Write an enzyme that holds these catalytic residues in place. Structure first.
Site, PDB file in Angstrom:
ATOM      1  N   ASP A  44       9.095 -44.528  22.360  1.00 31.98           N
ATOM      2  CA  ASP A  44       8.441 -43.425  23.455  1.00 31.98           C
ATOM      3  C   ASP A  44       8.619 -41.995  22.556  1.00 31.98           C
ATOM      4  O   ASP A  44      10.771 -41.388  22.563  1.00 31.98           O
ATOM      5  CB  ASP A  44       8.506 -43.573  25.084  1.00 31.98           C
ATOM      6  CG  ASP A  44       8.454 -42.171  25.643  1.00 31.98           C
ATOM      7  OD1 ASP A  44       7.519 -42.469  26.043  1.00 31.98           O
ATOM      8  OD2 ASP A  44       9.332 -41.335  26.335  1.00 31.98           O
ATOM      9  N   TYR A  49      10.988 -33.114  22.694  1.00 30.55           N
ATOM     10  CA  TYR A  49      13.005 -34.088  22.779  1.00 30.55           C
ATOM     11  C   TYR A  49      13.136 -32.751  20.549  1.00 30.55           C
ATOM     12  O   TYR A  49      15.294 -33.860  20.761  1.00 30.55           O
ATOM     13  CB  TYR A  49      13.313 -35.517  22.753  1.00 30.55           C
ATOM     14  CG  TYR A  49      12.094 -35.565  23.701  1.00 30.55           C
ATOM     15  CD1 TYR A  49      12.365 -35.355  24.861  1.00 30.55           C
ATOM     16  CD2 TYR A  49      11.565 -37.523  23.723  1.00 30.55           C
ATOM     17  CE1 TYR A  49      11.519 -35.701  26.068  1.00 30.55           C
ATOM     18  CE2 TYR A  49      11.075 -37.682  24.335  1.00 30.55           C
ATOM     19  CZ  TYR A  49      11.227 -37.328  26.087  1.00 30.55           C
ATOM     20  OH  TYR A  49      11.155 -37.936  27.227  1.00 30.55           O
ATOM     21  N   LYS A  78       3.586 -36.357  24.303  1.00 37.57           N
ATOM     22  CA  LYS A  78       3.377 -36.039  24.994  1.00 37.57           C
ATOM     23  C   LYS A  78       3.275 -34.930  25.228  1.00 37.57           C
ATOM     24  O   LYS A  78       4.292 -33.888  24.146  1.00 37.57           O
ATOM     25  CB  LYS A  78       4.832 -35.966  26.449  1.00 37.57           C
ATOM     26  CG  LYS A  78       4.821 -37.049  25.917  1.00 37.57           C
ATOM     27  CD  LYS A  78       6.304 -37.649  27.692  1.00 37.57           C
ATOM     28  CE  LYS A  78       6.998 -39.419  27.134  1.00 37.57           C
ATOM     29  NZ  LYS A  78       7.662 -38.889  26.638  1.00 37.57           N
ATOM     30  N   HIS A 111       2.846 -34.087  29.543  1.00 37.98           N
ATOM     31  CA  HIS A 111       3.774 -34.414  29.981  1.00 37.98           C
ATOM     32  C   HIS A 111       4.345 -34.022  31.962  1.00 37.98           C
ATOM     33  O   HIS A 111       5.669 -35.142  32.320  1.00 37.98           O
ATOM     34  CB  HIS A 111       5.204 -33.535  29.019  1.00 37.98           C
ATOM     35  CG  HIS A 111       6.323 -34.154  28.747  1.00 37.98           C
ATOM     36  ND1 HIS A 111       7.145 -34.217  27.571  1.00 37.98           N
ATOM     37  CD2 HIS A 111       6.726 -35.192  29.426  1.00 37.98           C
ATOM     38  CE1 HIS A 111       8.493 -35.191  27.671  1.00 37.98           C
ATOM     39  NE2 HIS A 111       8.515 -35.155  29.190  1.00 37.98           N
TER      40      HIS A 111
HETATM   41  N1  LIG Z   1       8.303 -38.605  30.229  1.00 34.32           N
HETATM   42  C1  LIG Z   1       9.143 -38.097  30.786  1.00 34.32           C
HETATM   43  O1  LIG Z   1       9.384 -37.143  32.112  1.00 34.32           O
HETATM   44  C2  LIG Z   1      10.618 -38.187  30.677  1.00 34.32           C
HETATM   45  C3  LIG Z   1      11.640 -38.283  31.524  1.00 34.32           C
HETATM   46  C4  LIG Z   1      12.844 -39.369  30.976  1.00 34.32           C
HETATM   47  C5  LIG Z   1      12.888 -39.192  29.996  1.00 34.32           C
HETATM   48  N2  LIG Z   1      12.136 -39.975  29.501  1.00 34.32           N
HETATM   49  C6  LIG Z   1      11.568 -41.477  28.615  1.00 34.32           C
HETATM   50  O2  LIG Z   1      12.436 -42.704  28.787  1.00 34.32           O
HETATM   51  C7  LIG Z   1      13.650 -42.536  28.540  1.00 34.32           C
HETATM   52  C8  LIG Z   1      14.708 -43.507  29.126  1.00 34.32           C
HETATM   53  O3  LIG Z   1      15.081 -42.719  30.049  1.00 34.32           O
HETATM   54  P1  LIG Z   1      16.436 -41.319  29.594  1.00 34.32           P
HETATM   55  O4  LIG Z   1      16.867 -41.478  28.564  1.00 34.32           O
HETATM   56  O5  LIG Z   1      16.470 -41.099  30.916  1.00 34.32           O
HETATM   57  O6  LIG Z   1      17.963 -42.468  30.032  1.00 34.32           O
HETATM   58  P2  LIG Z   1      17.875 -44.443  29.933  1.00 34.32           P
HETATM   59  O7  LIG Z   1      17.068 -45.150  28.964  1.00 34.32           O
HETATM   60  O8  LIG Z   1      18.261 -44.018  31.750  1.00 34.32           O
HETATM   61  O9  LIG Z   1      19.293 -44.074  29.723  1.00 34.32           O
HETATM   62  C9  LIG Z   1      19.832 -44.096  28.125  1.00 34.32           C
HETATM   63  C10 LIG Z   1      21.152 -44.005  28.457  1.00 34.32           C
HETATM   64  O10 LIG Z   1      21.718 -45.645  28.761  1.00 34.32           O
HETATM   65  C11 LIG Z   1      22.706 -45.539  26.969  1.00 34.32           C
HETATM   66  N3  LIG Z   1      22.311 -47.306  27.428  1.00 34.32           N
HETATM   67  C12 LIG Z   1      21.284 -47.655  26.772  1.00 34.32           C
HETATM   68  N4  LIG Z   1      22.052 -49.223  26.510  1.00 34.32           N
HETATM   69  C13 LIG Z   1      22.850 -49.611  27.088  1.00 34.32           C
HETATM   70  C14 LIG Z   1      23.612 -50.756  27.597  1.00 34.32           C
HETATM   71  N5  LIG Z   1      23.363 -51.596  26.921  1.00 34.32           N
HETATM   72  N6  LIG Z   1      24.077 -50.384  28.073  1.00 34.32           N
HETATM   73  C15 LIG Z   1      24.364 -50.140  28.643  1.00 34.32           C
HETATM   74  N7  LIG Z   1      24.582 -48.266  28.294  1.00 34.32           N
HETATM   75  C16 LIG Z   1      23.333 -48.602  27.286  1.00 34.32           C
HETATM   76  C17 LIG Z   1      22.311 -44.517  26.572  1.00 34.32           C
HETATM   77  O11 LIG Z   1      23.376 -44.948  25.702  1.00 34.32           O
HETATM   78  P3  LIG Z   1      23.353 -44.898  23.950  1.00 34.32           P
HETATM   79  O12 LIG Z   1      21.807 -44.287  23.941  1.00 34.32           O
HETATM   80  O13 LIG Z   1      24.807 -43.737  23.290  1.00 34.32           O
HETATM   81  O14 LIG Z   1      23.631 -46.143  23.196  1.00 34.32           O
HETATM   82  C18 LIG Z   1      22.348 -43.632  26.855  1.00 34.32           C
HETATM   83  O15 LIG Z   1      23.159 -42.558  27.781  1.00 34.32           O
HETATM   84  C19 LIG Z   1      13.792 -41.216  27.487  1.00 34.32           C
HETATM   85  O16 LIG Z   1      14.906 -40.993  26.410  1.00 34.32           O
HETATM   86  C20 LIG Z   1      11.981 -40.863  27.403  1.00 34.32           C
HETATM   87  O17 LIG Z   1      11.795 -41.575  25.745  1.00 34.32           O
HETATM   88  C21 LIG Z   1      10.764 -40.165  29.632  1.00 34.32           C
HETATM   89  O1  LIG Z   2      10.897 -34.216  30.463  1.00 33.83           O
HETATM   90  C1  LIG Z   2      11.293 -34.813  29.833  1.00 33.83           C
HETATM   91  O2  LIG Z   2      10.737 -35.731  29.402  1.00 33.83           O
HETATM   92  C2  LIG Z   2      12.859 -35.575  30.069  1.00 33.83           C
HETATM   93  O3  LIG Z   2      13.866 -33.994  31.071  1.00 33.83           O
HETATM   94  C3  LIG Z   2      14.382 -33.448  29.894  1.00 33.83           C
HETATM   95  C4  LIG Z   2      13.598 -33.119  28.381  1.00 33.83           C
HETATM   96  C5  LIG Z   2      13.959 -32.125  27.756  1.00 33.83           C
HETATM   97 CL1  LIG Z   2      13.957 -32.235  25.954  1.00 33.83          CL
HETATM   98  C6  LIG Z   2      14.502 -30.544  28.379  1.00 33.83           C
HETATM   99  C7  LIG Z   2      14.282 -30.591  29.996  1.00 33.83           C
HETATM  100  C8  LIG Z   2      14.374 -31.599  30.750  1.00 33.83           C
HETATM  101  C9  LIG Z   2      14.652 -31.400  31.962  1.00 33.83           C
HETATM  102  O4  LIG Z   2      15.307 -30.753  32.552  1.00 33.83           O
HETATM  103  N1  LIG Z   2      13.504 -32.715  32.822  1.00 33.83           N
HETATM  104  C10 LIG Z   2      13.212 -32.158  33.647  1.00 33.83           C
HETATM  105  C11 LIG Z   2      11.994 -31.640  34.923  1.00 33.83           C
HETATM  106  C12 LIG Z   2      11.271 -32.226  36.168  1.00 33.83           C
HETATM  107  C13 LIG Z   2      10.632 -30.966  36.640  1.00 33.83           C
HETATM  108  C14 LIG Z   2       9.896 -30.425  35.217  1.00 33.83           C
HETATM  109  I1  LIG Z   2       7.640 -29.588  35.914  1.00 33.83           I
HETATM  110  C15 LIG Z   2      10.524 -29.871  33.950  1.00 33.83           C
HETATM  111  C16 LIG Z   2      11.336 -31.060  33.733  1.00 33.83           C
END
Ligand SMILES: NC(=O)c1ccc[n+]([C@@H]2O[C@H](COP(=O)([O-])OP(=O)(O)OC[C@H]3O[C@@H](n4cnc5c(N)ncnc54)[C@H](OP(=O)(O)O)[C@@H]3O)[C@@H](O)[C@H]2O)c1
Ligand SMILES: O=C(O)COc1cc(Cl)ccc1C(=O)NCc1ccc(I)cc1
Length: 316
Positions: A44, A49, A78, A111
């Site tokens: 993803d 990012y 996205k 996104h």
């Molecule tokens: N569409 C959107 O708007 C949106 C928004 C948010 C996220 N996303 C996507 O979803 C992905 C995941 O969400 P997220 O990055 O917000 O957070 P997450 O996956 O809920 O948590 C990531 C954190 O958890 C830690 N971690 C991972 N595996 C672990 C384990 N086995 N034990 C303990 N800690 C662990 C990581 O540390 P380390 O990396 O230091 O190991 C990092 O600090 C994002 O990276 C992105 O690709 C999309």
């Molecule tokens: O949007 C994502 O995937 C994760 O969140 C981020 C990633 C970056 Cl690289 C920079 C900012 C954010 C962030 O502030 N997200 C919260 C957010 C909530 C509502 C709106 I509309 C836009 C952003």
């Protein structure tokens, strides 16, 4: 449980993927290489990012090494908010393709439902700190996404952070050509999303759960916020199953027929997080985890809350 889920475009999507938001550019190439080596087939990504070039280096090396074939990978990116305009969508997609070193994406998402003023800044603000909208709407942006399918740049299109009314708006679009394949939303035991998930699933849209571990590395984390990974109730379920808390948090959405995309740059955790296909949470475990809902969101942003299409005013 099977490793892939069937999308409404006829393609199969791996239910476990690697997240890349916050993965530092000097660590994400190795993270993705390790992930592919240990079995991940879904990554993803997003332009916002700022690490797609480095993700792409890993993908390209593993393709060149013949560790995997391109057809076996499922790469998601996205469209950022500053590219909602008709004349910008293709170029935004192409920049992502060029950075990822791909000739197509498996899935391309809007996104966020909100369009922002185009320009260099990802979050253009007025002098009082409000995001500057674009007059684009989600329907015209969707039509631009449909063109990408018809030009061969992407195999599937979808949405992210769309609320139930917004999903409905897309489904009810006059002249709709392709339904969204996926809605990618925040989902974990503190934000269980039962209403929105049921709606999407009932329409054949696959839901991807982001921040499944509660995003402990989110830059706006406060020392006081609730912590899934440290919740003794979840730790207890993990202990019962001889698994880690993270493994329970990843298995949970899988059993709800969701795709899940935990992020890590730690090689041991990347491997740990993939070892979730050989145990099962009971129905009682599932209901217990659902019971922890508190409507708590990682992903929200004050500066964007007055945008007409900001998604989190509606209940769901
Ligand atoms: N569409 C959107 O708007 C949106 C928004 C948010 C996220 N996303 C996507 O979803 C992905 C995941 O969400 P997220 O990055 O917000 O957070 P997450 O996956 O809920 O948590 C990531 C954190 O958890 C830690 N971690 C991972 N595996 C672990 C384990 N086995 N034990 C303990 N800690 C662990 C990581 O540390 P380390 O990396 O230091 O190991 C990092 O600090 C994002 O990276 C992105 O690709 C999309
Ligand atoms: O949007 C994502 O995937 C994760 O969140 C981020 C990633 C970056 Cl690289 C920079 C900012 C954010 C962030 O502030 N997200 C919260 C957010 C909530 C509502 C709106 I509309 C836009 C952003």
């Amino acid at each position: 449980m099977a490793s892939r889920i069937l999308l409404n475009n006829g393609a199969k999507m791996p239910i476990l993927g690697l997240g890349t938001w916050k993965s530092p550019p000097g660590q994400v190439t190795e993270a993705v290489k390790v992930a592919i080596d240990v079995g991940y087939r879904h990554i993803d990504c997003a332009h916002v990012y700022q690490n797609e070039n480095e993700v792409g280096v890993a993908i390209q090396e593993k393709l060149r090494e013949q560790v995997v074939k391109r057809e076996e990978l499922f790469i998601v990116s996205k469209l950022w908010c500053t590219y909602h305009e008709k004349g910008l969508v293709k170029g935004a997609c192409q920049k992502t393709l060029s950075d990822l070193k791909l000739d197509y994406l498996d899935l391309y998402l809007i996104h966020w439902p909100t369009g922002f003023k185009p320009g260099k800044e990802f979050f253009p603000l007025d002098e009082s700190g409000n995001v500057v909208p674009s007059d684009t709407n989600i329907l015209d942006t969707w039509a631009a996404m449909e063109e990408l399918v018809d030009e061969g740049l992407v195999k599937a299109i979808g949405i992210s952070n769309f609320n139930h009314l917004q999903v409905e708006m897309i489904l009810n679009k006059p002249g709709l050509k392709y339904k969204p394949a996926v809605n990618q939303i925040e989902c974990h035991p503190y934000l269980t999303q039962e209403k929105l998930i049921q709606y999407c699933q009932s329409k054949g849209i696959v839901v991807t759960a982001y921040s499944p571990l509660g995003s402990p590395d989110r830059p706006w984390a406060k020392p006081e916020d609730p912590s899934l990974l440290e919740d003794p109730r979840i730790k207890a379920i993990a202990a019962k199953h001889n698994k880690t808390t993270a493994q329970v948090l990843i298995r949970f959405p899988m059993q709800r027929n969701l795709v899940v995309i935990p992020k890590s740059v730690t090689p041991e955790r990347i491997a740990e997080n993939f070892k979730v296909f050989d145990f099962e949470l009971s129905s009682q475990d599932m209901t217990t985890l659902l019971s922890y809902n508190r409507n708590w969101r990682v992903c929200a942003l004050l500066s964007c809350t007055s945008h007409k299409d900001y998604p989190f005013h509606e209940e769901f």
